Write a protein that binds this ligand. Structure first.
Ligand SMILES: Cc1cc2c(cc1C)N(C[C@H](O)[C@H](O)[C@H](O)COP(=O)(O)OP(=O)(O)OC[C@H]1O[C@@H](n3cnc4c(N)ncnc43)[C@H](O)[C@@H]1O)c1[nH]c(=O)[nH]c(=O)c1N2C=O
Lengths: 133, 16, 666
């Protein structure tokens, strides 16, 4: 019913070695040049990737700034209220981004902030021009 | 034929 | 099996069922009542058991029925009907047995037997035992046909049959009990040795051989599963199947590498994509870092728009430093996954020229068993006789196999040096025209009732014909002779003055340098009591080596030995012998095979005797006058000696029934 394990004897393949005499040494060269054709293209992206690696030397260690460690307060200084209306104009609704700029306010306080002062700061007017970019 | 092999008798296609 | 059911197997017969031959002799019983059939099968097996129990002397019908046990020993007519069917088709009282009921005073019928061959000798004794006049025409000056025994001094070697393939259910076992025969087992252990003379290693020996058999089963699958037996309209040879199996494995090795390095380039290109984002991200990090430093230059206190611009660029720069690390986690996995795929590559190639050399030795081993190259062997039917293989060790005759035919031919009428030229079979009889091989003017005319023809298939296949059949053998017969195969196998014998080989090893190999030399002296044998080596030439090699001198052969032969045992160790041999069977006019080959396009069913056509045409027109269809026996005529056991022997018992039955009456079918 089935070949010995490891034998590969498909009906399709059998007609293919036997259509004619050298139809054997045909489809076995068809692989030796389809096996080098890839095998060069490895080294030929393997070397392009060795170039990109050289350009990324040392990483981004020159360009890091220390973490802004600061406990997270509850009252809204007129500074924090003003850092806020500007993040909303640069960050849309990404509260998460917004509560890093202010950095001692919480993503929740962020959400409440949008609610409480929406009439006063015309946050609506704000957000609609954020959308225009 | 196949019966004749006395050394290293082959297996494939037998009824074992 | 032991007991009565043992005897049925030792006689090549199912203990629990009637054979197709028992049916034509006993059709009132086979089609009768299920208990009936049982009673008969017991009578058969019980008799066989008696003969096989001590076959040195004749089994009278009296002795049988004496020992028969009630209720079986009641129906005496059935016992006669059974003791006759056995003795008649020679399942009992065949061989060299001291006769109880002495031979009849006056024989009836004349039978010329063409060839003092093993099949022919087998017939001669049965017909002579039956009460007929038997006379044998042999072309050689020695009795055995392809059982040749070279004898010189104490050196002894068979250039013909050499091994008994198993005593399980073998007729030859009975002969040994009757004949004096030194049967010694062959130990199957066979080392191998490549061209260098260095022994092969258990690693590769086993790696090769199992892949060989696996390749066999592959062809067997192609043959019976994919009905692969035609291609550009010809039949498929076993060799052709093998190379398409091998060529599909060399195909799969390449498909397997290609979808592996094609995995590497999929991950090289996931990395090439990855670095490109990293380099572009770094530039964005490099510039945001600038902008942050530039707006940090504005010193406190500052208004909130610029205080936002430092907070902002700081959050933006922490946002892209966080991306660039999750892209160096990801270069972590891919830089790893790509040493994975390089440290676990697949099989480098299907077979090393060191492998395919040791593989070509397993194909020489086939071409030895079939005495032909595998281009010729038929894909579906080459092994069709596998089911009747006997059981036990293979054995050898240390005192020379020829001791059997010489024992078999005692007391028969044999005319040596008598070359049959022409067989004339006519409605009233047969006349056989024979020259004397020494002085081929000298003519002999022999007249007889029926002619039993153990001519080897080669001699029949010969064109121009060694023997002319008057009238022509009909087209169904001649075409059965073209389709079949007679192949070739040769032996070199090397007779030294002392052992320089492993004496407890009976045989060892030699791997050949290319494919085309795979059978060239591929296997040696140490079987004879004296220090004798003996070496095979199978495959295409054996036919081609007939044209080379003994010296050249023995020279080559001697070399391979030196590479295995060392130049100092191997002395020049005292006497040496080289067979050339395709060259012998009383063989024209070695034994037979199922040629591509042939079947086991052409072997049956070779048995079917010939009944000549009416002499006077409008006369009644006559008797069948021309009979055939020999190793080439016996589908279930071809190419062997036991098989040839059986065939000549077959025609002793068939002849006696045709000329002395079927007295057991009432
Ligand atoms: C090299 C070799 C090795 C092995 C075997 C065989 C070989 C070759 N064979 C085959 C059988 O021997 C063979 O089939 C049978 O013996 C012939 O049994 P068979 O079917 O009777 O064939 P034959 O050749 O003896 O019959 C032909 C005879 O007829 C004669 N003859 C021919 N033409 C004639 C004419 N015109 N006039 C008069 N006489 C004529 C001729 O000289 C010869 O004596 C083995 N058999 C076995 O059992 N174990 C073995 O190991 C082996 N073997 C090794 O492996």
């Amino acid at each position: 019913r089935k070949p010995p394990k490891g034998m590969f004897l498909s009906q399709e393949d059998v007609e293919a070695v036997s259509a004619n005499a050298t139809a054997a040494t045909t489809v076995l060269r068809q692989l030796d040049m389809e096996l080098v054709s890839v095998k060069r293209q490895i080294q030929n992206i393997k070397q392009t990737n060795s170039a990109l690696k050289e350009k990324l030397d040392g990483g981004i260690e020159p360009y890091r700034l220390p973490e802004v460690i600061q406990k997270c307060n509850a009252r809204w200084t007129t500074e924090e209220q003003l850092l806020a209306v500007q993040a909303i104009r640069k960050y849309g609704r990404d509260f998460q981004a917004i509560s890093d700029v202010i950095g001692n306010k919480s993503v929740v306080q962020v959400k409440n902030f949008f609610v409480n002062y929406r009439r006063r700061f015309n946050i609506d007017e704000v957000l609609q021009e954020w959308e225009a970019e | 034929a196949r019966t004749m092999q006395t050394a290293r008798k082959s297996t494939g296609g037998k009824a074992p | 099996p032991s007991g009565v059911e043992g005897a049925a197997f030792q006689s090549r017969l199912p203990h629990d069922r009637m054979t197709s031959q028992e049916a034509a002799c006993f059709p009132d019983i086979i089609s009768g009542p299920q208990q009936t059939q049982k009673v008969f099968l017991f009578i058969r097996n019980r008799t066989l058991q008696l003969w096989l129990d001590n076959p040195k002397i004749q089994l009278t019908f009296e002795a049988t029925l004496q020992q028969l046990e009630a209720p079986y020993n009641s129906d005496t007519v059935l016992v006669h009907r059974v003791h006759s069917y056995l003795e008649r088709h020679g399942l009992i009282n065949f061989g060299i047995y001291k006769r109880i009921k002495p031979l009849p005073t006056k024989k009836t019928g004349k039978v010329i037997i063409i060839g003092s061959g093993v099949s022919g000798l087998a017939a001669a004794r049965q017909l002579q035992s039956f009460g007929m006049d038997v006379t044998l025409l042999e072309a050689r000056d020695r009795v055995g046909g392809r059982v040749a025994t070279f004898r010189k001094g104490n050196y002894v070697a068979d250039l013909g049959a050499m091994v008994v393939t198993g005593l399980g259910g073998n007729p030859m076992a009975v002969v040994s009990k009757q004949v004096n025969m030194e049967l010694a087992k062959i130990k199957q252990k066979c080392p191998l040795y490549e061209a260098n003379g260095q022994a092969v290693p258990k690693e590769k020996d086993e790696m090769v051989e199992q892949e060989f058999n696996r390749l066999l089963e592959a062809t067997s699958y192609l043959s019976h599963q994919l009905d692969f037996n035609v291609l550009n309209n010809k039949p498929v040879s076993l060799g052709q199947a093998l190379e398409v199996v091998i060529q599909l494995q060399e195909k799969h090795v390449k498909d397997e590498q290609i979808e592996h390095w094609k995995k590497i380039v999929k991950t090289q290109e996931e990395l090439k994509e990855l670095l490109n984002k990293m380099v572009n991200l770094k530039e964005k990090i490099k510039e945001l870092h600038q902008q942050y430093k530039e707006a940090s230059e504005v010193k406190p206190p500052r208004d909130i728009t610029a205080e936002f611009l430092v907070k902002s660029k700081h959050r933006d720069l922490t946002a892209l430093c966080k991306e660039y690390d999750e892209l160096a986690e990801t270069q972590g996995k891919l830089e790893e996954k790509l040493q994975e795929l390089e440290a676990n590559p697949p099989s480098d190639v299907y077979l090393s020229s060191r492998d395919r050399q040791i593989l070509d030795w397993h194909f020489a081993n086939l071409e030895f068993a079939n005495a032909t190259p595998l281009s010729t062997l038929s894909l579906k039917h080459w092994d069709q006789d596998d089911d009747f293989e006997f059981t036990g060790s293979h054995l050898t005759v240390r005192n020379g196999y020829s001791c059997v035919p010489v024992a078999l031919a005692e007391g028969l009428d044999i005319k040596l040096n008598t070359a049959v030229r022409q067989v004339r079979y006519t409605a009233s009889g047969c006349e056989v025209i024979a020259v004397n091989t020494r002085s081929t003017s000298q003519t002999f005319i022999y007249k007889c009732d029926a002619v039993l023809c153990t001519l080897p298939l080669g001699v029949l296949k010969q064109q121009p014909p060694a023997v002319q059949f008057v009238p022509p053998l009909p087209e169904w017969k001649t075409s059965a002779v073209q389709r079949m195969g007679f192949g070739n196998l040769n032996k070199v014998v090397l007779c030294f003055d002392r052992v320089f080989w492993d004496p407890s090893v009976n045989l060892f190999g030699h791997v050949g340098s290319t494919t085309a030399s795979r059978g060239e002296l591929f296997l040696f044998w140490n079987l004879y009591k004296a220090p004798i080596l003996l070496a095979l030439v199978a495959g295409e090699a054996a036919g081609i080596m007939e044209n080379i001198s003994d010296d050249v052969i023995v020279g080559r032969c001697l070399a391979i030995l030196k590479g295995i045992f060392g130049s100092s160790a191997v002395p020049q041999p005292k006497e040496t012998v080289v067979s050339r069977w395709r060259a012998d006019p009383w063989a024209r080959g070695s034994y037979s095979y199922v040629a591509a396009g042939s079947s086991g069913n052409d072997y049956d056509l070779m048995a079917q005797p010939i009944t000549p045409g009416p002499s006077i027109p409008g006369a009644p269809q006559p008797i069948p006058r021309l009979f055939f026996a020999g190793e080439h005529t016996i589908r279930n056991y071809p190419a062997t000696v036991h098989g040839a022997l059986l065939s000549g018992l077959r025609e002793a039955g068939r002849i006696a029934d045709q000329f002395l009456g079927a007295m057991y079918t009432l």
